[PDB]
Design a protein around this ligand. Structure first.
Ligand SMILES: Cc1ccc(NC(=O)N2CC[C@@H](CC(F)(F)F)C2)cc1-c1cc(N[C@H](C)CO)nc(N2CCOCC2)c1
Ligand SMILES: [Cl-]
Ligand SMILES: [Cl-]
Ligand SMILES: [Cl-]
Length: 269
């Protein structure tokens, strides 16, 4: 049982809305985060039931800690509160210059988290620097949390509405009814590795969203790995390429990926 009875959760400042509901800072045996829907439709109830149903299966330090939910008086999910920013914020907005050892550490922790989810047969489906939080700018927390991010104009009448830089080629073309897989999450992680080592989003030379969608889809685009830092290990550049392979089955799984990163971690001056 994880149901939090009514009147315990003290809701505070609103911080955002996200894809579903509204997210506030809270108090419940200390600071918390509260994702709340205010009304409930059968599709809203199914989203809630599924979101709790995934989170309740995760006990890992690099996954965002679920703490409990509220059925009455309204639908709500309570997670830990974290002081810090998303990886996206650090790298692209305020443009933090992390040391190479810390960039590899962030990569290692993200791999640890993704490996755990895949071991539990959980496909994230929307991994990206936005959904990697740095708790005290130190510890990676993977979740599902955007702010005029590159393509500011609304994609209301477009097919692909969400974030396309992290989507694998098979996920863009959508030839299968469900093209999401463990290898689709590996490609997304591949782009996160690119962000860490370049300090930049991929396809910077191109300014047409639709052209990136098309070209990544038909395999004419993959990120320019020469843009990495000079003290980036060759072993990382090789791993990055394996993660971003256009063909699905040629991409490795996180057990091998995490192994490769922990190896090159030990040997760097
Ligand atoms: C309150 C809440 C409840 C639920 C979820 N849902 C999930 O994380 N997931 C659903 C599927 C599962 C997939 C898996 F792959 F992770 F397993 C991940 C997120 C949040 C939330 C949403 C947000 N948004 C704001 C705008 C970002 O600052 N911020 C937080 N944090 C605030 C800062 O301090 C740490 C917390 C928390
Ligand atoms: Cl539990
Ligand atoms: Cl803009
Ligand atoms: Cl690029």
């Amino acid at each position: 049982d994880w149901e939090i009875p009514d009147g315990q959760i003290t809701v505070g400042q609103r911080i955002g809305s996200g894809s579903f509901g509204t997210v506030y800072k809270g108090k419940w045996h200390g600071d918390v985060a509260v994702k709340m829907l205010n009304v409930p439709t059968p599709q809203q109830l199914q989203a809630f039931k599924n979101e709790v149903g995934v989170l309740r299966k995760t006990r890992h330090v690099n996954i965002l800690l679920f703490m409990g939910y509220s059925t009455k008086p309204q639908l709500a999910i309570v997670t830990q509160w974290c002081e810090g920013s998303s990886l996206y914020h650090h790298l692209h907005i305020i443009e933090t210059k992390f040391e190479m050892i810390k960039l590899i550490d962030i990569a290692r922790q993200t791999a640890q988290g993704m490996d755990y989810l895949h071991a539990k047969s959980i496909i994230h489906r929307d991994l990206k620097s936005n959904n990697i939080f740095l708790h005290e700018d130190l510890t990676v927390k993977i979740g599902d949390f955007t702010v005029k991010s590159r393509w500011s104009g609304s994609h209301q009448f477009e097919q692909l509405s969400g974030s396309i830089l992290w989507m694998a080629p098979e996920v863009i073309r959508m030839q299968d009814k469900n093209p999401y897989s463990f290898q689709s999450d590996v490609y997304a992680f591949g782009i996160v590795l690119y962000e860490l080592m370049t300090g930049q989003l991929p396809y910077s030379n191109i300014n047409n969203r639709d052209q990136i969608i098309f070209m990544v889809g038909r395999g004419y685009l993959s990120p320019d790995l020469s843009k990495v830092r000079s003290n980036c290990p060759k072993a990382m550049k090789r791993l990055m390429a394996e993660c971003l392979k256009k063909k699905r089955d040629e991409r490795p799984l996180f057990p091998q990926i995490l192994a490769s990163i922990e190896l090159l971690a030990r040997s760097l001056p």
